[PDB]
């Protein structure tokens, strides 16, 4: 419970930006792989990259997401560029783009009541390797936290 003191920042990008928001690709262990800048915006979810190609996810597709206290953790089907995976990136504002996200993407006309949660089943067991390229896929969701956006029978 102690309050961090900004040390110094020399940057033209805010210590605050509301939408921009700076996130760190890491592994199942959480360790830095790659920094970069995620961007949300009422259409879909962007990330700004290196040089690389961006990667964009759209909301209607996030079928669940979660977010921890300094992480951001979101699923993404198999209706995008990367495919099916879960990606997490470390973020102390990950609150921030947890919760806008899901107000953007329920901005959209949508119909949403209020349903009781039902237990969820894993898997058996299933492993592979490498196969196309991308950021690292996870096999265990590391959040816990997980909202339901999109849904239709």
Known sequence: GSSGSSGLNRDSVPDNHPTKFKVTNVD???VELGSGVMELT???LVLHLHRREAVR????CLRRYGYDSN???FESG???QTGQGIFAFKCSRAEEIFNLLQDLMQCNSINVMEEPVIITSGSSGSSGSSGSSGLFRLRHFPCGNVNYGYQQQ
């Open 28 to 30: 199942d262990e959480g």
């Open 42 to 44: 009422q259409s879909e």
């Open 57 to 60: 996810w759209p909301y209607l």
């Open 71 to 73: 992480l951001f953790s």
């Open 78 to 80: 198999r209706r995008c």
